[PDB]
Every structure is written in structure tokens, then in C-alpha cells.
RNA sequence: ACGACCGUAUAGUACGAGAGGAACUACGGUUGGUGGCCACUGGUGUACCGGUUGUUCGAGAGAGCACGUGCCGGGUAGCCA
RNA sequence: CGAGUGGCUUGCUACCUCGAUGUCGGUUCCCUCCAUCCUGCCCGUGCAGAAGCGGGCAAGGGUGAGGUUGUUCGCCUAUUA
RNA sequence: GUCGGGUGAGAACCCCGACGGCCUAAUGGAUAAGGGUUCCUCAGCACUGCUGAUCAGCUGAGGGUUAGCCGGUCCUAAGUCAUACCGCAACUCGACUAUGACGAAAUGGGAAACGGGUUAAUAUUCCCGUGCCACUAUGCAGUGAAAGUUGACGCCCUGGGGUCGAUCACGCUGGGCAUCGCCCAGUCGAACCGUCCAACUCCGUGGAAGCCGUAAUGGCAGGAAGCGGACGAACGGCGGCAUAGGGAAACGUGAUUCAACCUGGGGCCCAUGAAAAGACGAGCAUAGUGUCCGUACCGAGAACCGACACAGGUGUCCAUGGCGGCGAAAGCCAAGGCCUGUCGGGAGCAACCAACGUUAGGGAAUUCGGCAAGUUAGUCCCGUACCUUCGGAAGAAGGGAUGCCUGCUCCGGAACGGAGCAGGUCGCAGUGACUCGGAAGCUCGGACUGUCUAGUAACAACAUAGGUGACCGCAAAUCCGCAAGGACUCGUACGGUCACUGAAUCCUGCCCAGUGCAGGUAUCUGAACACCUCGUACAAGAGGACGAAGGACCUGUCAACGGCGGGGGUCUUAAGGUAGCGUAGUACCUUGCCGCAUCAGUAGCGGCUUGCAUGAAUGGAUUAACCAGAGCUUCACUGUCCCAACGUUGGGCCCGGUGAACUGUACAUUCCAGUGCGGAGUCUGGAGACACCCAGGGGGAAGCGAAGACCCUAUGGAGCUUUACUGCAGGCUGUCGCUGAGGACUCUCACUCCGGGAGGAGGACACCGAUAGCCGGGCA
RNA sequence: GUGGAAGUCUGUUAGAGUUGGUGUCCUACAAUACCCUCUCGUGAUCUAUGUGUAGGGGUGAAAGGCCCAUCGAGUCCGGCA
């Protein structure tokens, strides 16, 4: 046969690639020597093209210039802070100590230092539960208790944005224009609509899988389709 | 649109053109390497043994 | 609202259009002062028409059910 | 190169209880086929004449174009049914 | 039950063509066969007449229009000698 | 095209005049690519030119392209290359990371040029006149000088300013017509220098509690209007340029609508609409310099691609010439271009064919089917059903009006803008041509726009929003690479990967036995190393102990593959078809039965339905809108038909010129029979037959065209599939090496990751190398 | 009343496509053309120029479509007599 989708994809061209060279910045949080007294003035709301969602501009004491990844409210005029020794407010960036549990939070880093990994799109938050000497629990937007260094930094309050997945694009168009954004190849064709030779789910007089969808780990690539290691399917039970 | 004599129109394009090494009108203008001695690829000029018969 | 869809689309998504953009297009109060003043900028962006205040919200809305239980904790 | 039918007289007769109901022959017509012809009806008739829209020749007069007549109205001959 | 004729149906056979003999129906146009549906002449009748039924000679001429169906066939309608 | 005329040995087609036409987003004007001398001139006709040629894109010889201020050049874009690094057996190979360079001639950014003249041929390049930029030098000014601005930007609506053009009014200049007094052309004048400034922003004054303002949004005691001021625009006005230029002459003035250009406001994004060089910021005089490359012509029904002077294909600018009209529409006509979509002559010009007009009465009877053709048509008023997702259906349907002329009214600043009124009046006909829907109903499918088999399929197929399931916390899931490495990713679960269903609406039942996936698992099974026993002075080898993933075994799981029967009042194999829908685009029997409709209905629609062999995301039912999708009916319509006729144009036929191809074993005037490998112009018997030629429609040559696509045969080929055979990648797992200290554990030193570093996490695992078992159509 | 939304409608504006005529052509004008008719025509739009992806590999709104008249595995040469 052919090489299925999934095999083009890892290439690299084009066509599977995200247009980069259209984004603005690569959010991460700033380096700090120490100290804390970092701090800054928003100076603008923008759209970040890679995201859907707003991005600030912000200019740091120290000269610096760069867009942040923005918590839901903060404005114009506003100042942010990023330290051990921050205030504890909307849009300011310190380690998961020295926040005080119970309190949302966003772009938590995986490893202190790495500039923020979880929770950085529209309208999410993690949520810090304990503390401790050695290990910060976090709980993650998909549910999952994640132990953190306490030395992580990450950011007050949950990301901008929210409730965009509330509208629907109501139209092929908008998503079209929405897909060209992304390193991603839209439409998608279903496998059961295309031939023997392109994916293991065509062929057939009729339109139908020809095995079971519920594939193995160690099914190969250009075999690994349909339900990936599914623990189970249906809706039932 | 046929794939014949109407889509022949619009070739008007230029690639292959006159080598500056080998003097063959081969030299590729979009990609700056000759199909004919191999100038803008290597050093070496091109040449493979399959161009003759195996014997020859 | 929907009406720009014709009798395209369906009940559903159409009606949900008109729902998140008649809130999406309500007069909100600034942040800032307190006026009415805000209307949508882009994707999540607000601003105030009166005092120029440019504030990062919700999608649709200006504050979001998150956003606000924020503010306590 | 003619085939066949219908109608009228025969006759409400022969036959028959009645009901009903022929024929030979003489007539008229129709239908299909056939060959020919255009006085007549009908078609065509970008021969021809008129009406009229747009535009061009300044107007008027008189004209060109609008597909092989702009359109509409009428139509001789001839060819036709 | 027994003897046949035809070569329209179907099957059998594998002789003819696989360096191709263009498929089904229809259509258009031509010639033919008789095992005759009508038309001409006859015989019989369980032939009164009228209308039939059966049979004989006869292929000159005729055998048409439609509704469903790709249909051949066939079903159905109204005319029809 | 025609009549004259010119040239010539020779003229239908070369040139001149007249008349007659063709092209109007092109058949005009300017160009990109591509061609490459095709451009111009002179001399020619052996070649090329669909005929001829004195002509030519042909032949020969000569000549022709002039730039500081038009392009290139410079910059950067997607991206490309080189060198370094690393990989590879290796390279002309390969990804990352660094550095450097490349990468835009119409159409990205961009220092600076206008008018006129001139040549056979160039021209913002030469010449005349006028102007401008950059750099360098001298001189005066200046210490400012880099922050900032600019370059520099999406889609939709819209206001204001405003040139050309067009039109209107009037004058002047030239011309046309000649029943009037009308009609045409012109009336010019740059870059540049100077100057003016609406809009936006802001300042002072002022002090609105309801005012201010718009086409619309809107503004305001956080200070509205008004008033005064700062900044501030055009390829625009005005002056200069200019007793420059140009014109035979006049060498105008006002106005409206206003492309270019300038400048504002509003709306949209699950979409956010380059960058860099350069410019400004940052004065003036005088002088010098401003190299290099491109510049001819075509740019197409003859200069490009398509073998051709090919009816094909091929980008940009002129979108403001007039009438007309909603219009960049039709039709007519300018300017400009052309008679080269390049063979001609003749016959009332037959048959037949191509395009087409018209046909009485009938009116779909034609046919698979109304295919083709026809009908309707523009604008306004009146009026408008079922159904519906309330958007729509809808221009439903149906009905009425429609010109010209005379005098007016209303909106508006006005239009050479728009809407109405009265009276008069001609025709068969007033959207008079042209332009310009036929309408209505039932059923199926797919919801919609969208996509597709370049070249027989446009569809019900693909996509889509919407619904659902699966995998993954980022050193991830998924995917590429032999490796070095890479996409996803300037991304982080409101993510993005992998699949299914395919808008809305009402819904989506039962089955985990098999298969698949996932988890668990006392016990069983389960490879190699290391270990123990036997054996061998060692070794092979035989056996044992221990046992990973995997499997047995158990559990979960159907919006996972799929299934939802026979029998009786349970059996196979887990369950035994629920809502619906049903003679289905699924129904063998079948033209099912009943009804509707028709003279007659294997069709269609409705009801019934035991469904050969329907049914729920293998989605079910249903459904407004939509549709060059499939079937059916009605009104209207008509040469589709009855049944054909006549006519128009181009052929056809004759003549001059040009001039192929298919096909050909031989013979050949055949016909009726027969015979023959059973389908004969050629054999046999008879019949017929004087030879040659023209047209015709094609009966035969099993006519020509293609070593039959169907079928079988070959120990033929290829693509595809799988629990076929054998292998291969890849995933999981044990073991060994890297690898270190004190059947479960701590540590840190290798190694890996995070951090700029300090340092932090992890850690003898992981990665990587070797091997062993399992899975293994992803691949061979 | 204003406003002017829309994968909105009509539309040979330009431009893009290719439903029917199973017309013309079928030793063509053309190795995919001509004409009439028809679909789309502010958007998932069309287009020029540049640039990326290469052969069991691309690209593919999926037709086994397309990758220079070549595609169920391009073309060239070689293996090869
Ligand atoms: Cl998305
Ligand atoms: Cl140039
Ligand atoms: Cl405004
Ligand atoms: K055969
Ligand atoms: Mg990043
Ligand atoms: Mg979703
Ligand atoms: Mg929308
Ligand atoms: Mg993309
Ligand atoms: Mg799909
Ligand atoms: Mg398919
Ligand atoms: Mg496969
Ligand atoms: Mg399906
Ligand atoms: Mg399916
Ligand atoms: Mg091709
Ligand atoms: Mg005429
Ligand atoms: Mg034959
Ligand atoms: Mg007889
Ligand atoms: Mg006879
Ligand atoms: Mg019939
Ligand atoms: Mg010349
Ligand atoms: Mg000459
Ligand atoms: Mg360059
Ligand atoms: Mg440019
Ligand atoms: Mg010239
Ligand atoms: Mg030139
Ligand atoms: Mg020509
Ligand atoms: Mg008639
Ligand atoms: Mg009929
Ligand atoms: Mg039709
Ligand atoms: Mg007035
Ligand atoms: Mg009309
Ligand atoms: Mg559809
Ligand atoms: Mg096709
Ligand atoms: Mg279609
Ligand atoms: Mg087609
Ligand atoms: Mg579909
Ligand atoms: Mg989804
Ligand atoms: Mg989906
Ligand atoms: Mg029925
Ligand atoms: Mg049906
Ligand atoms: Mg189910
Ligand atoms: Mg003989
Ligand atoms: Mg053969
Ligand atoms: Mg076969
Ligand atoms: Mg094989
Ligand atoms: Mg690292
Ligand atoms: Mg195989
Ligand atoms: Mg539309
Ligand atoms: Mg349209
Ligand atoms: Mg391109
Ligand atoms: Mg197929
Ligand atoms: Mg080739
Ligand atoms: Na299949
Ligand atoms: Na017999
Ligand atoms: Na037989
Ligand atoms: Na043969
Ligand atoms: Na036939
Ligand atoms: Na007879
Ligand atoms: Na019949
Ligand atoms: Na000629
Ligand atoms: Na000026
Ligand atoms: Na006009
Ligand atoms: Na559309
Ligand atoms: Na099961
Ligand atoms: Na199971
Ligand atoms: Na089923
Ligand atoms: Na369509
Ligand atoms: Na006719
Ligand atoms: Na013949
Ligand atoms: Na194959
Ligand atoms: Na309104
Ligand atoms: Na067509
Ligand atoms: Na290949
Ligand atoms: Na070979």
C-alpha cells in the first residue's frame, strides 16, 4: 500500500507545518537574577495567531519589551510583577510557594525555570492544593493531581479568553479560516472513505472498517488508527 | 482543461539554460545545478557508468 | 444576531449564535470607571469607549464565571 | 393500380309464434393505396409595400445596421397539401 | 397410444470465426413463406333467419391508433372488415 | 468587398482614390513572460505563404537599441546555497545549530525628470529649454544627533476634499449642411519652486444638568455648543515656470457629476492581516562626480507554448468616448485599427447535409423521457396558499398598467436626477427591436455554500458545521529519519493527535459468547544470560532451579468488529429486533391487494404489509431551505408527432489554381442455386452480361480501422486482502555492556534533563550498543 | 425610519466551471476543438509571479485523482541479447 496520513504528517512539509514565521512570541515567563523587583507596565492587548486568544504587551523596568501570556483582566496602565517576593494579584508571576493554596493559577512551569508548560489556553487554570517543603500538588485542567517542584514559577488567575469552545463555527469557512493558523491539515478525510492501497480501513463494497477500531500500543505507524489503546469505547456503562 | 495542447499554453517559464561549466544548455536557473555535468552539485562533474553498456 | 444565517444552519447553532453574540454585543461597565462603555476589541479583547481602558476577558463576555471566582480566592 | 368498408333502394320484405331479420341487383359516399395537377382553400413567399422601436447620416426628406428580414402587419408568382 | 413435418422456442454438440463477422429492443426501408386473422369462392352444421361454430381452396390486397414496461412477450382501452 | 487608377514581363488578392463593410475590454492603446533580429532600408522570388504575388514575419546585403534622476543594481519575503559542526562504510548524501551569501525587472520596499523637437529605424536615454537627487570638495552656519517619526500594510460600509473626462450654459476660432438652424472639432500649456488648507489631534476661553452632532455610530461637569489658537492634505487651488512650448486660428468663462490623488467615521475575526534597506529627525553657497548592465521589434485568429502563419492556451494597465440603460449588459456609433479569423470564378444555385425562419387544423397523439424547440420575460400598482428551523416559502399564483404630444405638480442645492397629474393623440402591437422567469403539485436523496474522476461519471459519492468515542501532563500522545536529527510547536487539555457519524428536530433498545482493545491474575505456560547437576583434564551436549513481556484464566468494554434466529406454552452461539420505517434506490414471489388518476397507468402517489434478505452514530424516523441530482402529475406552450411544405445562409454540382490520406496476394460485369472447414464475385450447374464515364444513397466485399477488452490455456505479470507460506521493520519484555558506593533499599561519581550561572531534578535507571522471547499485511 | 449583515439572491461585469444538445467535428482548426444551453460569480473565491514536497515516494474535500499528451506505482539510461 501507500503510506497512510499519519506517515505524511511527520515529514515536515508545508502543508503539515504551522505557519511560524505568522506568530508573534514564544511565551515564557522572564528570567529573574533574584531579588523579585522585577516589574512592568501593560502596554498593549494583542491577538497571539498561535493561540486564538489575547496577549499582552508589557515593558519591564530594566527596558525590557516582550508579550506575555495573559490572565483574564488585566488592562491597560496595569503593573505586573515577577519574583519570590511579588504581590499576590491578577497577572503576576512567582513560585508555586510562594502563592497561597486554594488560588487559580496559569503557565505553570514543568521544572522551575523552564518558563511555563500547563495550563496556558484560553480561559484555563490550574489549581494549587498543597504546599510543602519538597513537593507543590497542582491539579491540572484535565483533572490530574501533578506533584511540582515548589520552585516553579507560575502565573495569578486563569488564562484570557474563556468560553470560546462555547460558540459554534456554524460554517466550514470559519473553521477553514481558523485550520490556516495551525500546523494542520484540514479537511480530514474519513478512512473508511478512501481505498485499500491508502488506509487500513478502506476498501470494501460499503463504507465500514474491515477489523475491530481498538488498535495496540505496538501496532506499528501506518497501522495505528482508529481507537489508539482504547480502555474502552461506547458511552455505555 | 486538457492535459494535451491547451496546457501546453502556458509554458513560458524558464529552468534549464546555458551551462557556464560544461557549455550544455542544462544548468537549471531555479535550482542552480546542472542535469548535464553536475556544476552547482559537485565538484566531480557527472558521469555514471550506466551511460554505456555494461561491457563498453 | 442569527438573521444573517437565512434558514441556514438549524435551530441549535443558530440559536446559540444569537444567544452568545446579543451578550456578547450587551453594554457592559468598565472595570476602570464604572460606565457602560465596553465594547469587544477582537477575541477577548475589551476596551471602554469612554476612558480608552483595554482589559483581557472572556471570548464572548467580558468577565467569565472563572474569571470572577478568581477575584475571591 | 387498385384494396376495403359504410349508407340508400331491395325491405321491416324472404325466414320466423314472436323477438328479430337477410340476399341478388342498382345507386351514393368514405377510407387506404396509386398517378397527376394548383382555378379554388391553405402554407411558404429574408420579391414586394406598409407600421414601428434603438442608433447613425445635424433636422426634414431619404437612408444603413440590429445575422444573414430588427420586430410587427399584408402578400404576387412559383413550389406545394 | 402410435407415425410424422417444420426449424419460430429451448436444450444438446463444439464443426466455423478469438491478428474482433459490433449486443438486446425499437426504428426506418425492401423482398419472401402459409400452418389464413380480414377480404373472394366453397363444404358441413346440434344450418329457420340474423349471428355463429367447424372445415376446404386461396398469400391479390389489408392487418391500423393508443395507456404502463428498455422490453421481445404480455396486460389494458377505444376504434376496426 | 466593388469601380476606377498606379507599378510590372506577368496583378482578384502590392500600392493610390472613391464607394461598401468588419472590431468597441477589443481586431484599439501600453506592457510581463517567452521569442531573438523577427525591427528599418535597399535588392529579389529557387524556398516559405492553404491560390497568385511585383507583396511579405521569406532569400541576400546593409543599417538600427545612446539614461545620475525608466528598470536592474540595493533591501528584505516564503525559502535556497556555501563554510563550520555532527551523522554516514562513504559521497556529488543527511537534519540541527552557528556564520556568511542568495532570494522580487509586469506585481513587495525604493534618493532624484518634466515639456517640446528630431530619425527610415531609438528616445522620460539624443537635441532645445527648464528642474531635481546623492556623494565628494571648498566656504559660511551648526553643536545639536538619537529618542522618536517614517518605510509599514486585513476584509466590509461610508462621509468629506478633489483633478481628468463627460455633460450643461454662454463667448471666441475652424469646419459641415443647405427649405429649417442645426451639427462636428478646437478653445492648450509640465516637472518643478512658492504659497493656501479641509479632516484628525491638542491648547485657552467658555460653562451646557439637556444640549451638541452625524449618512449612520455617537459626544459631554473626567467640561457640550460657541469663540480664539497650535499642529496639519492632495498627482488639488493659486502665483511663478511661460514676450517656455505648442497651434492654421481662437489660444474661453461658469457649473454639475466627479476615475486618479488626498483625508475622515463606522462595522467584522475561535481569521489579527510582512520584513529589511532606506528616508525624516538634521541649514545654506559654490564646484566636481554620478561608472556598470537592460533599452530594436512581436506580445498574438502569423513574431510566445501547442511538430503548422494551429478556430486551442497565455499575466498586468486603459472599467470615465457618444446614444442607450440598472449596468463594465444588448443594439447603434466615434477615435483608433482592419478588409490577413486570407484561394477564386459560375449555375434561381437540383438531390442530399450544416446552421436557421415560417407553417393551417390538431396539440406530447412523438419518445425510455417533452430530448430539441417553444412559452414566459424589463418596470410599476394591486394581490399572494400549503408548509416552515419564523430566516423562508415569494418575483408563489393571479390581476392591472406600460408609447408619443401639450401644460404642469412633488422631493432636492441641483443634475443633462427621481416620483406623480391633467388634457390631447397613432398602431395589430408602447419592456413595440434589443435586453428580458414559463407556472403549479406529489415522491426519493444529500441538510445548506463547498469538492471530484485534466480527457465518456458532477451524483445520492468526498467535505462540512454539528454529535460521539479513543490516546496523551509536554523528557507526553501521534508521526519522519540509517543516523546526526525532525514535524506537530512562537503550541500545553477551552490543547492536538487518532477514528466513526454527518445541520436542525424527536430519538438512538437488547448481546461481552467469538474477534479486537484495556486491566487484573493464586495457579499453569513462558527465551536467553548468570546459577546448580551430569558429561568432557577443556568443549560440544543432556538435565535442573529461577521466570519477564505474552498466553491460559477473570473482569471491563458495542457511538469496538459485528449480531438481534429455529422450535415450544428452550436449542445453536451472547442476545433473539425495542421507537420507527416498510412491496423501500432494501420485496424473490411481483405488474402484490385496495384506493386515487386515465378511454386504457408493469409508472407515480396513498393505505395495507407476515420485511426472499428493514431498524437505530454499520445511525433510525423525520424534515423548512437549497439542487445543471432520480421518478411522477397539471396549466401554458410548441413542427416532438399527425405530415410534411416553402424559404434563408454556407457547402454540395461545373470552371481555374493548389493538392494529400485510408486501402491494395492475385484475378474481378455479376445474379440465382448448389457445393466446400458447416457464412463463396473466383469451385459446380444454370441465368444474365457491348465498352467507358457522372451523380447518389450505402445492400454486399462476414468492407476499413485495433495480434479480442469477454471466455479458457500459460507450472505469465501486476495492484489489493487475509487467522495462506516464509521472512522484514516497529512496539513490548528478560539479559549483557556503558556501570559507580553502602528480593527489597539508600547514596552519588558516570550518564540524562532543567538553569545564563550558581545550582536544581533524575540516577546507576534512562538513553545508546548487543542479544533473547512475544506481537507483528506497516512492509517484502 | 435608519443601518447594510450574508460561504445570500439575480446576473455571458471581469473571471472561474462544464449540465444538456448524446448537435458540429471525429485522416479535426484541436492527440480533448466549435456553437447554443447551463453552474459559480464577497468567498472553503479566482489569479500572476516566486517558493516547498520526488517515485512504493509526494499531493490527494478520496476519483486510485494528480506528479510535463506518461500513473493500480512518472520518465531516462543501465541490468538486457
Ligand atoms: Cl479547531
Ligand atoms: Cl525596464
Ligand atoms: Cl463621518
Ligand atoms: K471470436
Ligand atoms: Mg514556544
Ligand atoms: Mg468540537
Ligand atoms: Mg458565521
Ligand atoms: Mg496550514
Ligand atoms: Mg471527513
Ligand atoms: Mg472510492
Ligand atoms: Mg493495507
Ligand atoms: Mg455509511
Ligand atoms: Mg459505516
Ligand atoms: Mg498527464
Ligand atoms: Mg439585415
Ligand atoms: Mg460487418
Ligand atoms: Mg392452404
Ligand atoms: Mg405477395
Ligand atoms: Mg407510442
Ligand atoms: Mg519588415
Ligand atoms: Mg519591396
Ligand atoms: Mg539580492
Ligand atoms: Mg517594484
Ligand atoms: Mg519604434
Ligand atoms: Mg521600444
Ligand atoms: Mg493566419
Ligand atoms: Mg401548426
Ligand atoms: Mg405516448
Ligand atoms: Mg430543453
Ligand atoms: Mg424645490
Ligand atoms: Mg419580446
Ligand atoms: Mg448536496
Ligand atoms: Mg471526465
Ligand atoms: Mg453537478
Ligand atoms: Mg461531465
Ligand atoms: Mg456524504
Ligand atoms: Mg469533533
Ligand atoms: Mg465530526
Ligand atoms: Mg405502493
Ligand atoms: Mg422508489
Ligand atoms: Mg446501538
Ligand atoms: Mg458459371
Ligand atoms: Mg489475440
Ligand atoms: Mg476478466
Ligand atoms: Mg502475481
Ligand atoms: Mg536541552
Ligand atoms: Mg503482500
Ligand atoms: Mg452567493
Ligand atoms: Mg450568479
Ligand atoms: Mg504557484
Ligand atoms: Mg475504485
Ligand atoms: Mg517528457
Ligand atoms: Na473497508
Ligand atoms: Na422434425
Ligand atoms: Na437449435
Ligand atoms: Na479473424
Ligand atoms: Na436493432
Ligand atoms: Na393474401
Ligand atoms: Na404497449
Ligand atoms: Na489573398
Ligand atoms: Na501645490
Ligand atoms: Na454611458
Ligand atoms: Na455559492
Ligand atoms: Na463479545
Ligand atoms: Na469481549
Ligand atoms: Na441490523
Ligand atoms: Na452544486
Ligand atoms: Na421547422
Ligand atoms: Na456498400
Ligand atoms: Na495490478
Ligand atoms: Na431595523
Ligand atoms: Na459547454
Ligand atoms: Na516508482
Ligand atoms: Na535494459
Redesign the pocket.
Known amino acids: 500500500?501507500?503510506?497512510?496520513?499519519?506517515?505524511?504528517?511527520?515529514?515536515?512539509?508545508?502543508?503539515?507545518?504551522?505557519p511560524?514565521?505568522?506568530?508573534?512570541?514564544?511565551?515564557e515567563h522572564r528570567?529573574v537574577?533574584?531579588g523579585d523587583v522585577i516589574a512592568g507596565t501593560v502596554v498593549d492587548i494583542?491577538?497571539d495567531?498561535?493561540?486564538?486568544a489575547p496577549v499582552a504587551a508589557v515593558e519591564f523596568e530594566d527596558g525590557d519589551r516582550r508579550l506575555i501570556?495573559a490572565p483574564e483582566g488585566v488592562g491597560v496602565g496595569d503593573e505586573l510583577q515577577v519574583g519570590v517576593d511579588a504581590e499576590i494579584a491578577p497577572g503576576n508571576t512567582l513560585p508555586l510557594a510562594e502563592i497561597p493554596e486554594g488560588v487559580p493559577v496559569c503557565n505553570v512551569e514543568?521544572?522551575?525555570?523552564?518558563?511555563g508548560?500547563?495550563?496556558?489556553?484560553?480561559?484555563?487554570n490550574a489549581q494549587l492544593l498543597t504546599h510543602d517543603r519538597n513537593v507543590a500538588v497542582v491539579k491540572?485542567?484535565?483533572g490530574?493531581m501533578?506533584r511540582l517542584?515548589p520552585?516553579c514559577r507560575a502565573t495569578i488567575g486563569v488564562?484570557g479568553?474563556?468560553?470560546?469552545?462555547?460558540?459554534?463555527?456554524?460554517?466550514?469557512?470559519?473553521?477553514?479560516?481558523?485550520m490556516?493558523?495551525?500546523?494542520?491539515?484540514?479537511?480530514?478525510?474519513?478512512?473508511?472513505?478512501?481505498?485499500?492501497?491508502?488506509?487500513?480501513?478502506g476498501?470494501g463494497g460499503r463504507?465500514?472498517?474491515?477489523?475491530?477500531?481498538?488498535?495496540?500500543?505496538?501496532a506499528?505507524?501506518?497501522?495505528?488508527?482508529?481507537?489508539?489503546?482504547?480502555?474502552?469505547?461506547?458511552?455505555?456503562? | 482543461?486538457?492535459?494535451?495542447?491547451?496546457?501546453?499554453?502556458?509554458?513560458?517559464?524558464?529552468?534549464h539554460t546555458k551551462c557556464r561549466r560544461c557549455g550544455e544548455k542544462s544548468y537549471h536557473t531555479?535550482k542552480?545545478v546542472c542535469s548535464s555535468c553536475?556544476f552547482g552539485?559537485?565538484?566531480?562533474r557527472?558521469?555514471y557508468?550506466?551511460?554505456?553498456?555494461?561491457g563498453e | 444576531r442569527?438573521?444573517?444565517?437565512?434558514?441556514?444552519?438549524?435551530?441549535?447553532?443558530?440559536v446559540r449564535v444569537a444567544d452568545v453574540?446579543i451578550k456578547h454585543?450587551k453594554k457592559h461597565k468598565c472595570p476602570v470607571?464604572?460606565?457602560k462603555?465596553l465594547?469587544?476589541a477582537?477575541?477577548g479583547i475589551w476596551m471602554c469607549?469612554?476612558?480608552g481602558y483595554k482589559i483581557a476577558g472572556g471570548?464572548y463576555q467580558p468577565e467569565?464565571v472563572?474569571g470572577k471566582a478568581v477575584m475571591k480566592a
Open positions: 500500500g501507500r503510506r497512510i496520513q499519519g506517515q505524511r504528517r511527520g515529514r515536515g512539509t508545508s502543508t503539515f507545518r504551522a511560524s514565521h505568522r506568530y508573534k512570541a514564544d511565551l528570567k537574577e533574584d494583542e491577538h495567531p498561535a493561540r486564538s501570556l514543568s521544572s522551575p525555570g523552564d518558563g508548560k500547563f495550563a496556558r489556553a484560553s480561559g484555563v491540572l485542567p484535565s490530574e501533578k517542584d520552585q488564562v479568553g474563556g468560553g470560546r469552545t462555547d460558540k459554534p463555527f456554524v460554517k466550514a469557512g470559519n473553521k477553514h479560516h481558523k490556516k493558523a495551525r500546523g494542520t491539515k484540514w479537511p480530514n478525510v474519513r478512512g473508511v472513505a478512501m481505498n485499500a492501497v491508502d488506509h487500513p480501513f476498501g463504507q465500514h472498517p474491515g477489523k475491530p477500531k481498538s488498535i495496540s500500543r505496538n506499528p505507524p501506518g497501522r495505528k488508527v482508529g481507537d489508539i489503546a482504547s480502555k474502552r469505547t461506547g458511552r455505555g456503562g | 482543461t486538457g492535459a494535451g495542447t491547451p496546457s501546453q499554453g502556458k509554458k513560458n517559464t524558464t529552468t531555479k542552480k553536475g552539485k559537485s565538484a566531480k557527472r558521469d557508468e550506466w551511460q554505456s553498456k555494461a | 442569527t438573521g444573517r444565517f437565512g434558514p441556514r444552519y438549524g435551530l441549535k447553532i443558530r453574540e454585543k470607571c464604572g460606565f462603555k465594547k469587544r477582537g477575541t469607549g469612554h476612558c471570548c467569565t472563572a
